[PDB]
Design a protein around this ligand. Sequence first.
Ligand SMILES: CCCc1ccc(N2N[C@@H](C(=O)O)C[C@@H]2C[C@@H](N)C(=O)O)cc1
Lengths: 278, 275
Amino acid sequence: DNHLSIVTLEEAPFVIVEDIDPETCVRNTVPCRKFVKINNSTNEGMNVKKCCKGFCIDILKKLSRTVKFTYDLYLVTNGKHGKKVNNVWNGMIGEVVYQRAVMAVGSLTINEERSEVVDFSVPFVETGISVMVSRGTQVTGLSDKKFQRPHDYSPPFRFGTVPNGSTERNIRNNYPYMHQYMTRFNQRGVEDALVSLKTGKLDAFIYDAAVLNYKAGRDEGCKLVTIGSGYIFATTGYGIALQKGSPWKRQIDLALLQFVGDGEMEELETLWLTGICH
Amino acid sequence: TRLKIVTIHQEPFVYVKPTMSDGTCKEEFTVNGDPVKKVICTGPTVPQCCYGFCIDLLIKLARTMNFTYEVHLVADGKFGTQERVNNSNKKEWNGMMGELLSGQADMIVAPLTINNERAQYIEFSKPFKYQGLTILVKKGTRITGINDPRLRNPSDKFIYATVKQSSVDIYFRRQVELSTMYRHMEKHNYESAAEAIQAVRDNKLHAFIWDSAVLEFEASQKCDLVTTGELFFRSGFGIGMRKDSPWKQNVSLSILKSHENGFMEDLDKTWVRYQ
Ligand SMILES: CCCc1ccc(N2N[C@@H](C(=O)O)C[C@@H]2C[C@@H](N)C(=O)O)cc1
């Protein structure tokens, strides 16, 4: 059967979620359903029709046409990208692991922990751990001594991330003192961190490279900049997650490599990712 | 039972130096004090000393996955493209691609570009290095980059080329939009990157289109050379294995773990990044 259950997750500009036009999904979007709970003390809820678009949705449309499959797209509601809580997965990875979806499409980072329980496509956009600063600030990257040994400098660099995600876990494993120091500058979200940068409350923001590149590209006044791509730490990419040993992996991989080689991927990046800022 | 590893001369990923008369390899350390691990390579019949980025990665993969190896340099000196067999409808790969598919090698450990053409026939690891394509010229040569008029409207007064039977050769041959540029390059392509880089210094080749991870290292060591500083296409290097090889899964897991380990960051600092 070439009709597949596919899970996604809202994160602009990769997956943007809209309501139906007051009653179909307007063009450039695809239908995506979302289970909406009645309240927080029940599992009862209602399936709501939504409309999904963005960089990775355009990937899915190309794949569906090239690999020849149909799909029912739905948005994850327990968790986000994929986190193992007491050896039990949530998010998009959990949907694939526990076989409610055969494919996950979104801003899903390829890492070792997830690849042990799901199969990953080839990466379709590069990402990693990057650093964003105000224009003029000099840092080399995550491994900069200004981050590793913050108190070797006076005043110490004020830098943080959004906790509970992949970035904090990587820093905790790799740079224990940097993690200990930077929790004082924990940011509640990406938008919060951008404001702290632009208002001088923060010197640097460490986060996903693809997201930081998108945010710097559209920053008002082009005041926020990221490090060069050669300094991104733990270079990886967003990939499509499939069930372990899935028969779709090979043709999905060849389709994505075809999109990259023939300029289709660059067109989607121009359409969704590249901003006005240099 | 010993994995046959094929590789290629391509600094800073693979250095190739003569052996000592002992048959062993000169012991060195980096300027920062780390040991330079060297393995014996055979190549064009003679034992030699090989070391660098991809050799460090091979040693890490071998220790992690608990296998032994023997390294040899690709006999024809090429990376690998697919060519028509004359008087035949058969096709065959040259370079390291051909050695892997024929069985002369069990694994390609080299700056081997992942693309759709090669992925049809072999299995790539997850990328151990992300980079792209750029242009190298002699200091004093001034071009804007891939869209410079002297490249889009070629002529015999400005000679640009790439390496024969390489991923870059594939990339320009396949795209309709690069038909004019490819017609110029196929008359001037070089047998290896080292010969092309030397031709740029000797002012016999005016522009060299090649991998950024290699060209930027060359510019950082040879003051008479500069790059455009611009990546016009992004790609990655992967370990190459045959279809359904028993090492595919764990090789990719080790590469992902090494990226998140900071181990690839250590290799990047040791071999790739310079002034
Ligand atoms: C694997 C090492 C490289 C790396 C790549 C990206 C990240 N980011 N950090 C996450 C976060 O902190 O919120 C968000 C994003 C991961 C996200 N796309 C996900 O899929 O979880 C971290 C590490």
